[PDB]
Design a protein around this ligand. Structure first.
Ligand SMILES: *[C@@H]1O[C@H](CO)[C@@H](O[C@@H]2O[C@H](CO)[C@@H](O[C@H]3O[C@H](CO[C@H]4O[C@H](CO)[C@@H](O)[C@H](O)[C@@H]4O)[C@@H](O)[C@H](O[C@@H]4O[C@H](CO)[C@@H](O)[C@H](O)[C@@H]4O)[C@@H]3O)[C@H](O)[C@H]2NC(C)=O)[C@H](O)[C@H]1NC(C)=O
Ligand SMILES: *[C@@H]1O[C@H](CO)[C@@H](O[C@@H]2O[C@H](CO)[C@@H](O[C@H]3O[C@H](CO[C@H]4O[C@H](CO)[C@@H](O)[C@H](O)[C@@H]4O)[C@@H](O)[C@H](O[C@@H]4O[C@H](CO)[C@@H](O)[C@H](O)[C@@H]4O)[C@@H]3O)[C@H](O)[C@H]2NC(C)=O)[C@H](O)[C@H]1NC(C)=O
Ligand SMILES: *[C@@H]1O[C@H](CO)[C@@H](O[C@@H]2O[C@H](CO)[C@@H](O[C@H]3O[C@H](CO[C@H]4O[C@H](CO)[C@@H](O)[C@H](O)[C@@H]4O)[C@@H](O)[C@H](O[C@@H]4O[C@H](CO)[C@@H](O)[C@H](O)[C@@H]4O)[C@@H]3O)[C@H](O)[C@H]2NC(C)=O)[C@H](O)[C@H]1NC(C)=O
Ligand SMILES: *[C@H]1O[C@H](CO)[C@@H](O[C@@H]2O[C@H](CO)[C@@H](O[C@@H]3O[C@H](CO)[C@@H](O)[C@H](O)[C@@H]3O)[C@H](O)[C@H]2NC(C)=O)[C@H](O)[C@H]1NC(C)=O
Ligand SMILES: *[C@H]1O[C@H](CO)[C@@H](O[C@@H]2O[C@H](CO)[C@@H](O[C@@H]3O[C@H](CO)[C@@H](O)[C@H](O)[C@@H]3O)[C@H](O)[C@H]2NC(C)=O)[C@H](O)[C@H]1NC(C)=O
Ligand SMILES: *[C@H]1O[C@H](CO)[C@@H](O[C@@H]2O[C@H](CO)[C@@H](O[C@@H]3O[C@H](CO)[C@@H](O)[C@H](O)[C@@H]3O)[C@H](O)[C@H]2NC(C)=O)[C@H](O)[C@H]1NC(C)=O
Ligand SMILES: CC(=O)N[C@H]1[C@H]([C@H](O)[C@H](O)CO)O[C@@](O[C@@H]2[C@@H](O)[C@H](O)O[C@H](CO)[C@@H]2O)(C(=O)O)C[C@@H]1O
Ligand SMILES: CC(=O)N[C@H]1[C@H]([C@H](O)[C@H](O)CO)O[C@@](O[C@@H]2[C@@H](O)[C@H](O)O[C@H](CO)[C@@H]2O)(C(=O)O)C[C@@H]1O
Ligand SMILES: CC(=O)N[C@H]1[C@H]([C@H](O)[C@H](O)CO)O[C@@](O[C@@H]2[C@@H](O)[C@H](O)O[C@H](CO)[C@@H]2O)(C(=O)O)C[C@@H]1O
Ligand SMILES: *[C@@H]1O[C@H](CO)[C@@H](O[C@@H]2O[C@H](CO)[C@@H](O)[C@H](O)[C@H]2NC(C)=O)[C@H](O)[C@H]1NC(C)=O
Ligand SMILES: *[C@@H]1O[C@H](CO)[C@@H](O[C@@H]2O[C@H](CO)[C@@H](O)[C@H](O)[C@H]2NC(C)=O)[C@H](O)[C@H]1NC(C)=O
Ligand SMILES: *[C@@H]1O[C@H](CO)[C@@H](O[C@@H]2O[C@H](CO)[C@@H](O)[C@H](O)[C@H]2NC(C)=O)[C@H](O)[C@H]1NC(C)=O
Ligand SMILES: *[C@@H]1O[C@H](CO)[C@@H](O)[C@H](O)[C@H]1NC(C)=O
Ligand SMILES: *[C@@H]1O[C@H](CO)[C@@H](O)[C@H](O)[C@H]1NC(C)=O
Ligand SMILES: *[C@@H]1O[C@H](CO)[C@@H](O)[C@H](O)[C@H]1NC(C)=O
Ligand SMILES: *[C@@H]1O[C@H](CO)[C@@H](O)[C@H](O)[C@H]1NC(C)=O
Ligand SMILES: *[C@@H]1O[C@H](CO)[C@@H](O)[C@H](O)[C@H]1NC(C)=O
Ligand SMILES: *[C@@H]1O[C@H](CO)[C@@H](O)[C@H](O)[C@H]1NC(C)=O
Lengths: 162, 321, 321, 162, 321, 162
């Protein structure tokens, strides 16, 4: 994708993170596990929900066909009527399909963006107190217990402390 | 010790399309196109439709004797007419401005039939021999029940001068007609007078019909033709009929009591015995989707029609193998 | 010591909408939808419109005596007609192909009235008693000023054969009419001849009108009806009138001197005494915006009409609290 | 936003920078202040101006309604005319509103992109001669006077000199 | 030692437009708009068009003697008619429902002319003096070849009663007409009977025409007028003609053997002697582009028409100076 | 562009790389030259090819004009017919031109994205074994022969080895 994270330098998603779209995985001497980042997840839910409702409501006012009949010597206007009704259907079909194509591409990129931004947020906290492995992970120079891990998820990781 | 950033995956096989790539598997998606219907004609919002069955709007309104089912129809939501109803004009001819009338019915939900010129009132003319074998009823020759085919009495068709005044609050649909005889001999044989006319007048209308003699092919075993006309008689206005032959006179006329949204739907289907909030010629719709692809002509609170086979929006993200 | 990268903020409260978020506050924005008008009918580019007031296009062109204001109207930009003008056809009847004529006027900015058949020229017929109480003028019975209602003289209506030749460079709009009497007695009482006709011919036209007797309701106190017809007589062509009764003859006819863009606007409003470069039925527009939402039917150099309540583009960036 | 800078790792804008959309804030022993980056600002003004004119001119050719009248027995074609005129209005209303929605989103992202790119431009000059604080600021290892600051804004910051 | 990341550049000068920037030079691009045509009218898919040249659809079908070229035309793909063909109705008049007929021809690729009422069969009337100097052929007075202008024989025009039955499998296009004389004297001089009519009947049709006398301007040196009518006679149906004067009778009528896609194209161009798979009024198209800007009215397998001067998509990337 | 690489921190393209859209240039004691990155190049070819075909096929169903004639007293419906035929042409012209504008902008950005992502891929391998020069190049701390260079292009650059 455009932002290089999803199926990029982060090779795959996690079956094991069920409580969110984006988050953290930690491992140390006490154990390991997954923790969803609630803020970025909730921003994502709001963006996508608004998008869907925006798409629905923009296609709210749209052409409606009506039955109209014509006799055997009104063939021209009958045909005019048919081309008009058909013309508008094709226009709205085009609008609908293109909108879905375009916004689908944007929705996938949006998720990629949110993942990269979360990765950078953590990178900018850790700075040179950890090795950037190149696959989404940071290996610490110091032992980092669960309290330490939590502070990375907090935004609180006290850099000068380590 | 390490911390890793990552994203969700699941067992989803749902796919979406984009401009650059097709069939991208995602973790979550949302279909927005309704593809199914129940395949039935149904009551719209409780209110049952008028299902004309084998009759047409003409056969109904003129009162074709094969269409007694619809002799006093209650309020409808929409109307259903076949593509080629068999019981149209039993006696061959034309219906003048038929389409403009049908269009007028899309604004109408209920008629109430009333008598304006009683059949017994024709004391100078014979009102009970105006029948034909082309319009049979229970083995015998009959005729359009709402109009009176008048013929001469004791070899005399004196000039008719009758006038109805719309004292009702509601607009009135009046129907009448003219008979075109086969030859010069049939004119005298039915009406005696060789040259005839029918003059009709309202506040707006100013008509004068003359019968036209011509050699016709038989249609339903008859060479003669009937040409039916109509008008909307406003409140407090009066219609005036003067004629000396060939007159098909009004017996009954319909009051327009209820106006509003309606439609004439083209369908071979029959009553589903069923209820819905959105109806199509192929079946009814019950869904919360913003779009459907069933049929363009709908009635009620419906989704928007598109010609798509598939509309699915990504909500989640690119799912991992 | 440090250096920081950053971006602009200000006291702006302007908001824009996006697909994913609504009411996003930005530092700068640009409205592109014109929402206001002045509420007046105005001169378009200096050139004042024809404001028919209580008259209709028919009352004007035929010369209804209540419409003397418009007896010789100068060049117009557009025309303004009410929805239900009171001074239409004072003597009841019809105007044949009225809509096709009105449509012809959207291509016309100026008529010049000229006399083609002088009123004095009718030496064999009575041309000065063709009036009715339905078309009053200053307390007395009058008539459409541009056509002559001819009746018999000394109990004789001999056949009329008159012919006008368009020697003008400009297409000519000619109006005439036929009178439908009430009964067989009124026909003789006015024209004597029991069976009458009017035949009209040009290079293209080939007409033959016959009056139609029928019992009508009174409209403006008259049972009789007038049915008005028209044609465009090309340069160097001649119109030919032959009749033996019921003829409403041309007196004056309009030359089409100026063609071009124009329109018949429907509005109850009156002259604003005012100038504009873009006019709507609700008022005039003066703005540089690419869009407006006032009214779809406009004339002049206008923005494009949309049904939006709001169109605002972001130019600046997301503003900080 | 998609690029993570605006209302991202740079938490808020600056009331105090009035001469541009993007720029620098410096502080050292001699004092402090704001300086707009003219190049990226002017690129932004050109992009947005072209966009607006592009939007205006694409909606230049667009449907225009005309008055047409019909008698009492031309109800079908009158209705056809009405559905046609209305149909096109709805199409153009849709086009206009959607275009504004879509391009507004793109305009906000464009600004976010320009801010991130300016931040990276400076980051790639300073390299390891400064601490990346994580909030848009770089704290220098050496004293950086106004001449030094100006060279960072120049593109001239002589890395081997410090 | 170093490694660098970079991207392609080349000598390309191709440019594309975007929302924010115009005339951006790119390394590769793809034009998608076809701008050229060959400027000729051509065979569509092998099948040559009907090129009416100076004749019109009327002159052709009625059989104007100047249009002998098209006396038995083979199957066509499309039809080409000029804007103002000189050989239309040589004898002045009208063609009734002409446009509805032309529209019917867009569904037709081939007629086969057959004789329904032989010219020799008129033993009680004179069938070989129905000619005029307005329709010349080789210096002499002639007439529309497919219809017979009948006049009196030995000072007698007795009533005509002729009837044709469509025993063919294919729908039949029948043409006939009525003659409007100049004055009361010319009526007797040609047909004797002062009051005449023509009655035409099928299963559907019920017509009665009366000639209309009026003073006309000369058109092609004739004051008289001809008014031509038509119908589609279905299989197994019969048309019935009764008249006592002014009758222009069918000689030949066209069988509709082939239906399908076709069109009447308006063009001053002549046959290019050429083949194509997509044709316009300005020339033919041979390209694989999805769009073109030649002309909106096309026939065949064509690209989609747009009013653009330029549509070019970027494929490569921003090229370096 | 949005991603900052093309005509950004990488100032210009390379006339000398003819076998691909994106790739590497190396120089060491043995010599120098260009090598296209086939994977990212081929991803780009597939994206753009699909895009073009998507654009073509969406405009596949679209309004078609038909010849219809009217007499001298059918001026209203003739005009209705004209406004209808013209209205649809303007709609489809708008759709086509806007689509091209919008997708062209996206296509240029896509290329910029692919270049940035390739640059980051290499950056995340080299890590602190090379100097990030700031112009698209990495200068090595150790001698890097052609085998070494190839491993950077591989994805195989053995970081702990140097
Ligand atoms: C079909 O039949 C209907 C009903 O049978 C006909 O409607 C009726 O038409 C007649 C006229 O022919 C009217 O007669 C009188 O109408 C007015 C009423 O005026 C006011 O008063 C009533 C009573 O409250 C009120 O309801 C009305 O709304 C109105 O405000 C009389 O004034 C009038 O007499 C007038 O006297 C004036 C002064 O004394 C004079 O200046 C006038 O010149 C005039 O002589 C008249 O006697 C009925 O009112 C009317 N019915 C209704 C319900 O409106 C209908 O005409 C007929 N159609 C046709 C085509 O014949
Ligand atoms: C309504 O009235 C108008 C005007 O009063 C009528 O228009 C006029 O119609 C008559 C015919 O009835 C024409 O008469 C003569 O026209 C031509 C003129 O020819 C050329 O010369 C003039 C002079 O410069 C030039 O302006 C013309 O443009 C043209 O080039 C005469 O040649 C013709 O006589 C002919 O002589 C030929 C050789 O000698 C013969 O072969 C011909 O057969 C013919 O005899 C004739 O005398 C007027 O020209 C014409 N006026 C105008 C301005 O065009 C109009 O016809 C009338 N309408 C109706 C329906 O009656
Ligand atoms: C124009 O001319 C054509 C042909 O010249 C006319 O068509 C013909 O019309 C006549 C009636 O006037 C028909 O005559 C007979 O038709 C049926 C045929 O019935 C079946 O058998 C045939 C033979 O295989 C089959 O092809 C048919 O499809 C059909 O299944 C006869 O049965 C009928 O006689 C009937 O006998 C019944 C029992 O004995 C009685 O109940 C009936 O009342 C009736 O007497 C009759 O003799 C022709 O069939 C018909 N030709 C064709 C090809 O269809 C056409 O009518 C004419 N037009 C006009 C306007 O006059
Ligand atoms: C995010 O996480 C960090 C690290 O886990 C949080 O800091 C820790 O917060 C806990 C709970 O408030 C503190 O516990 C307290 O300890 C004191 C005495 O030690 C006791 O008096 C209290 O009753 C309580 O048990 C703990 O001190 C602290 N640990 C560290 C290493 O800082 C931080 O509060 C969180 N911040 C946010 C914004 O979520
Ligand atoms: C951007 O900024 C840097 C640093 O501020 C500029 O370098 C400085 O440029 C000034 C003005 O040209 C130089 O001043 C000159 O000093 C010499 C002798 O010292 C004198 O002969 C001249 O008359 C003038 O006063 C100054 O030397 C120089 N300082 C440093 C530390 O480099 C640089 O020119 C600017 N570059 C761009 C592209 O804007
Ligand atoms: C990508 O490139 C790296 C470095 O160029 C590749 O490693 C090298 O691969 C070559 C070819 O397979 C190896 O050559 C072999 O050498 C052994 C003994 O030295 C010999 O028995 C074999 O016949 C062959 O000649 C070479 O050892 C190796 N060099 C280094 C420094 O690792 C690597 O294979 C490539 N990987 C991918 C995924 O493309
Ligand atoms: C009111 C009346 O005259 N009714 C007659 C009817 C009409 O005279 C006729 O339809 C007017 O066109 O004709 C009826 O008899 C028909 C015969 O007139 C015809 O020659 O042959 C028909 C058989 O196909 C039929 O017998 C009729 O319609 O049945 C008799 C009716 O009382
Ligand atoms: C030219 C002429 O005959 N003018 C008459 C006029 C006409 O005879 C009549 O309108 C033709 O239909 O009639 C006038 O008188 C009217 C009476 O004919 C009618 O019976 O009652 C009317 C009152 O509502 C009226 O008196 C007319 O129009 O006023 C008299 C006019 O000179
Ligand atoms: C079948 C027949 O009567 N043919 C005549 C023809 C007609 O009588 C006439 O067109 C019916 O309207 O008239 C022809 O002669 C014309 C004269 O009638 C007219 O007065 O002057 C004309 C010269 O412009 C012409 O001479 C005709 O059409 O040529 C003679 C034809 O046999
Ligand atoms: C994307 O997937 C759809 C759905 O499976 C594919 O549509 C099928 O295509 C096969 C041939 O590959 C046809 O035989 C079937 O008729 C299609 N099935 C359905 C349900 O539509 C489609 O081909 C795929 N598209 C691409 C570009 O890979
Ligand atoms: C965005 O702001 C607009 C403008 O203030 C809001 O529109 C108002 O909504 C309130 C209810 O919240 C209504 O009572 C008013 O009638 C609206 N005012 C105007 C001027 O339109 C809108 O609700 C906001 N939208 C969202 C999604 O938050
Ligand atoms: C982009 O380039 C086009 C093509 O060269 C320019 O179009 C020309 O504009 C000049 C004036 O600059 C006119 O004189 C010509 O008539 C145009 N030529 C063609 C072939 O169209 C266009 O002006 C440029 N647009 C921008 C915004 O720079
Ligand atoms: C997918 O996983 C869900 C767990 O949320 C489970 O309910 C469902 O049965 C699974 N379906 C398949 C096909 O594996
Ligand atoms: C409509 O379908 C829904 C399922 O979405 C179902 O709950 C219900 O049975 C249906 N409602 C009605 C009123 O038929
Ligand atoms: C916003 O700030 C500007 C300074 O440019 C000032 O002119 C204006 O008065 C201020 N408006 C408000 C509401 O604070
Ligand atoms: C139009 O409005 C502008 C403000 O945008 C104003 O300057 C001017 O008074 C108006 N112009 C005319 C010609 O009425
Ligand atoms: C551009 O370079 C190509 C090499 O692929 C060459 O064929 C062509 O002649 C060159 N054109 C110009 C104008 O330099
Ligand atoms: C059509 O044009 C192509 C070039 O794209 C050319 O090869 C060929 O000559 C043409 N084909 C036909 C059938 O005229």
């Amino acid at each position: 994708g455009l932002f290089g994270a999803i199926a990029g330098f982060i090779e795959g998603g996690w079956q094991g993170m069920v409580d969110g779209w984006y988050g953290y995985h930690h491992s140390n001497e006490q154990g390991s596990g997954y923790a969803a980042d609630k803020e970025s997840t909730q921003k994502a839910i709001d963006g996508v929900t608004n998008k869907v409702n925006s798409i629905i409501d923009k296609m709210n006012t749209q052409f409606e066909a009506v039955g109209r009949e014509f006799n055997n010597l009104e063939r021209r206007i009958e045909n005019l009527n048919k081309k008009m009704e058909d013309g508008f259907l094709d226009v709205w079909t085009y609008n609908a399909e293109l909108l879905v194509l375009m916004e689908n591409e944007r929705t996938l990129d949006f998720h990629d963006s949110n993942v990269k931004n979360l990765y950078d947020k953590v990178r900018l906290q850790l700075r040179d107190n950890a090795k950037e492995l190149g696959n989404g992970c940071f290996e610490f120079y110091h032992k980092c217990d669960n309290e330490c891990m939590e502070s990375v998820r907090n935004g609180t990781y006290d850099y000068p402390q380590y | 010790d390490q911390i890793c950033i990552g994203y969700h995956a699941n067992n989803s096989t749902e796919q979406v399309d984009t401009i650059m790539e097709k069939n991208v598997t995602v973790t979550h998606a949302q279909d927005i196109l309704e593809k199914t219907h129940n395949g039935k004609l149904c009551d719209l919002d409780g209110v049952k439709p008028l299902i004309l069955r084998d009759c047409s709007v003409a056969g109904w309104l003129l009162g074709n004797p094969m269409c007694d089912e619809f002799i006093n129809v209650p309020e409808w939501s929409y109307i259903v007419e076949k593509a080629n109803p068999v019981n149209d004009l039993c006696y061959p001819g034309d219906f003048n401005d038929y389409e403009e009338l049908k269009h007028l019915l899309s604004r109408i939900n209920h008629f109430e039939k009333i008598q304006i010129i009683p059949k017994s009132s024709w004391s100078s003319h014979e009102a009970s021999l105006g029948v034909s074998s082309a319009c049979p009823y229970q083995g015998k020759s009959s005729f359009f029940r709402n109009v009176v085919w008048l013929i001469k009495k004791n070899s005399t068709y004196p000039t008719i001068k009758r006038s109805y005044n719309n004292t009702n609050q509601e607009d009135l649909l009046v129907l009448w007609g003219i008979h075109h005889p086969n030859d010069a001999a049939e004119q005298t044989k039915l009406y005696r007078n060789p040259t005839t006319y029918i003059s009709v007048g309202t506040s707006t209308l100013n008509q004068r019909l003359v019968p036209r003699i011509a050699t016709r092919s038989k249609v339903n075993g008859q060479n003669g033709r009937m040409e039916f006309f109509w008008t909307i008689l406003k409140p407090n206005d009066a219609i005036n009929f003067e004629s000396n032959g060939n007159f098909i006179a009004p017996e009954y006329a319909y009051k327009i009591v209820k106006k509003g949204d309606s439609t004439i739907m083209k369908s071979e289907l029959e009553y589903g015995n069923c209820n819905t909030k959105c109806q199509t010629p192929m079946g009814a719709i019950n869904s919360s989707m913003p779009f459907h692809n069933i049929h363009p002509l709908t009635i009620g609170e419906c989704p928007k029609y598109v010609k798509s086979n598939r509309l699915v929006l990504a909500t989640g993200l690119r799912n991992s193998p």
